[PDB]
Amino acid sequence: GDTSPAQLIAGYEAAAGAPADAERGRALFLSTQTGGKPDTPSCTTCHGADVTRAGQTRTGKEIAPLAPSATPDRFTDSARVEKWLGRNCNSVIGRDCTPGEKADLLAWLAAQ
Numbered sequence: 001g002d003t004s005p006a007q008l009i010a011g012y013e014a015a016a017g018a019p020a021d022a023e024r025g026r027a028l029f030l031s032t033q034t035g036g037k038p039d040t041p042s043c044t045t046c047h048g049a050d051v052t053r054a055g056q057t058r059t060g061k062e063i064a065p066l067a068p069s070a071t072p073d074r075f076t077d078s079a080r081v082e083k084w085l086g087r088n089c090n091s092v093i094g095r096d097c098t099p100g101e102k103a104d105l106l107a108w109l110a111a112q
């Protein structure tokens with residue numbers, strides 16, 4: 001694509017002022033939130049708790065696995081990551097994700 005997963009995470013770490021923490025990324029992805037839309041309390045609502053398996057939209061359509069081990073071109077387009085993180089962080093958490101959250105989330109997801 002136009003980027004690597006490491007280039008994306010390094011850009012978020014620089015904006016956050018701190019290195020990514022994959023354990024924090026895992027905890028946020030699996031968390032149940034209450035600030036967003038009622039139908040999407042968690043990232044897992046659509047991507048599941050195991051991102052090597054397919055996910056599902058709110059209507060039951062299949063979403064390709066988020067793990068790069070299952071779907072190889074993941075996180076290789078910078079605009080596509082921002083586009084989905086913009087929409088999905090707002091739906092789940094109710095606000096954009098911070099650069100530190102994005103760094104943490106991608107560092108966990110990029111290793112799956």
Ligand code: HEC
Binds near residue numbers: 076
């Ligand atoms: C359903 C309403 C979703 C919720 C809740 C979350 N995501 Fe999602 N995500 C969804 C779709 C339909 C898509 C696009 C289709 C695809 O196969 O990519 C995505 C995509 C992403 C991506 C982009 C991956 C890439 O190709 O670079 C990321 C990084 C992502 N989703 C992360 C993510 C997080 C962190 C979420 C909780 C805040 C989350 N998603 C929720 C559908 C839905």
